[PDB]
Amino acid sequence: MLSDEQMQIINSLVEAHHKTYDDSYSDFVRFRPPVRRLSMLPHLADLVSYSIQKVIGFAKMIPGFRDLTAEDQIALLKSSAIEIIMLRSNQSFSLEDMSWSCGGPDFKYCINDVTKAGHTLELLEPLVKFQVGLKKLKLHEEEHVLLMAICLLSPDRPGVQDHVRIEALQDRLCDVLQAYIRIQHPGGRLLYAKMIQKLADLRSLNEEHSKQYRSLSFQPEHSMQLTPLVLEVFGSE
Amino acid sequence: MLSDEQMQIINSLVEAHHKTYDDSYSDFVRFRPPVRRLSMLPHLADLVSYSIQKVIGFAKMIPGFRDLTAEDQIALLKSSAIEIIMLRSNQSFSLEDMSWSCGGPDFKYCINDVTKAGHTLELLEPLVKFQVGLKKLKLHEEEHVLLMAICLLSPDRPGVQDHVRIEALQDRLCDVLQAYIRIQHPGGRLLYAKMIQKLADLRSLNEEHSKQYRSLSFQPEHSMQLTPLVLEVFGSE
């Protein structure tokens, strides 16, 4: 059985997701259009910038996050934003088409659509391999959300100052996930282990993106196309 | 008569305008859409940001500007960008509708469309009065372009270091304008004087916009909607 408190964490983490993810992708029309030089760069920056806004809404609703100091919240966020984005992006990734399908044919993002925004297959290849490996796991909603909140609360990120408290927080969430799979997932298996394997991949994808972002952000004709939010989060200050 | 050199300045200043102003307003579709909270703020920031890019293209083509030092070019630009923008905006301002008409009905910018982007009638009132006062003058192309290049080369802006050279430049351009009106404008009249009157207005409109921009740029939920270029030009660094 799960304790009353562990089901409250599950209740409130699932609801936080539903408030911050729109299965209709309707706000995509408010972005700058995509063009198919780095022609896809405006529209993706607007897209990621919007997602950062949603990750911050989700994070404000993880039990315990609201109570860390302001510096710790920012350091966690700056270091894990790109990985949470890769995680929530799994919900729109279709196994067929091998593309992110956000509704219409303009928001179908093949791998060629991403290269026209400054990235190379040295990142896109492991990214897509990550997206099918996650898709084949067939996670429940409650598992997907737990995975996100755990990746956020990792202590081993640059800039944290209260490891003991954020690690205590992360460990309470591992416990809830393990308990969920035991009681509520059939056969049990090593789902928990394949899930924790996926965390170690995001560390490697994080690093690649940050290298390629640095090259883009040094070229003033490309940083000009970013949003203020993107520059604040993926910058070093 | 005008000397061979004064007609070269007129030739090359008119061509610079034609390269940097699109009477079709076709690139407006690449911006973020307008919405009618400050709902018009995305689309206008994208709009002004695009115009700053065109003012820099024009300025690089004024005889003598390319030869000032890099610091002087930037100081001139930072201080006069908003006024050149107000000047080139006259070309799309219709006397009827009392709005800027950039083609379709989405790019008709009444005065209400601008208030939904953070500005008040304490700036919009003298702005529209400026736009009809300029419209009624019925300037030739060669006069409109000269007016812009003169307003750019004023020495009395914060940050200039070589007044004597940029004033020598500005004075050569006043001479060309006076000569143009004598030879090429009918009756002569005090057109030159009403034109120089319009410069003194832009100084007053400049100040109002910069006050209201400062209030907007201090609110982080509104600076988030600006572009990097706008933040770099209207910031103080």
């Binding site: 911050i56 404000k60 302001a70 966020l77 604040e232 989060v233 | -």
Partner: peptide, 9 residues
């Protein structure tokens, strides 16, 4: 840090 602080309410 400006935008993130305000966003973090």
């Amino acid at each position: 840090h400006k935008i993130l602080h305000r966003l973090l309410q």
